[PDB]
Ligand binder design. Structure first.
Ligand SMILES: [Mg+2]
Length: 267
């Protein structure tokens, strides 16, 4: 039997309109009684906890920033991976002379040096609030950051990616999230390491854990679970590593399999 249920949000529990169907909501509600529910997302911690409170008036053990943050409703953040203020300072001092548009994620708040069109459109599309801080260099250099993000034309961004990777590949992870978004994040952090950490903390055993995913990012969690469910919309690689491929996230792919799994709770 299974007693721990891990769900990615985007492309999984959330449909393409970023909402959770009533069917999936009700099934989670039933499990949450007596059993453990875990949400794992690449989104900010606040954004993730907000979805939790919106559909369920509470919070659950949570994996945010794709593994950098592990949160427990009672303890709060018990894992907080970030770019060390040193490598962070080096990156900022290196990047500024290059006149680019960068923003920083600090203590769960998105900051941008200048209030331009780049930031406006990014916060809009990845729906999050941001704050303009001209002195962001000092904020980061002295407070540390979960991650940095550069926004430019796919052209210049492909070039920036090139030089920042060659220069910092050794102490940080640099990759394009999309044609116009370049991200810099803590080296070896991912959803799998975060889930394994949570497991050690909570004393979960792999055999009682189920994970639902659709991502390359979620593939890491699969190694830490006893049962693996890929969404029908998952990339080919994820489906081939799963045990079962349920319906799409636009339907209630989660419920479709969730209702058939051998589980404690619900008696
Ligand atoms: Mg996803």
């Amino acid at each position: 039997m299974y007693r721990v249920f891990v769900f990615d949000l985007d492309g999984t529990l959330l449909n393409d309109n970023l909402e959770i169907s009533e069917k999936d909501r009700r099934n989670i509600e039933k499990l949450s009684r007596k059993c453990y529910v875990v949400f794992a997302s690449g989104r900010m911690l606040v954004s993730t906890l907000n979805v939790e409170k919106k559909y369920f008036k509470r919070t659950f053990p949570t994996i945010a920033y794709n593994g950098a943050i592990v949160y427990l409703p009672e303890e709060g953040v018990i894992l907080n991976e970030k770019i060390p203020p040193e490598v962070a300072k080096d990156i900022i001092e290196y990047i500024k002379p290059l006149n680019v548009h960068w923003q920083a994620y600090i203590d769960d708040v998105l900051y941008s040096e200048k209030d331009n069109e780049e930031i406006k459109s990014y916060a809009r599309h990845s729906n999050v609030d941001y704050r303009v801080e001209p002195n962001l260099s000092e904020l980061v250099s002295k407070m540390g950051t979960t991650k940095l993000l550069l926004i430019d034309t796919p052209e210049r961004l492909d070039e920036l990616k090139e030089i920042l990777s060659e220069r910092f590949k050794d102490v940080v992870k640099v990759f394009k999230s999309f044609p116009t978004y370049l991200e810099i994040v803590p080296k070896n952090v991912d959803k799998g390491k975060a889930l394994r950490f949570l497991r050690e903390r909570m004393n979960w055993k792999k055999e009682e854990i189920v994970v639902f995913g659709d991502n390359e990012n979620d593939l890491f969690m699969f190694e830490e679970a006893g049962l693996r469910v890929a969404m029908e919309n998952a990339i080919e690689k994820v489906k081939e590593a799963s045990d079962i491929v349920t319906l799409t996230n636009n339907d209630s792919g989660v419920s479709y399999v969730l209702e058939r799994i051998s589980t404690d709770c619900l008696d």
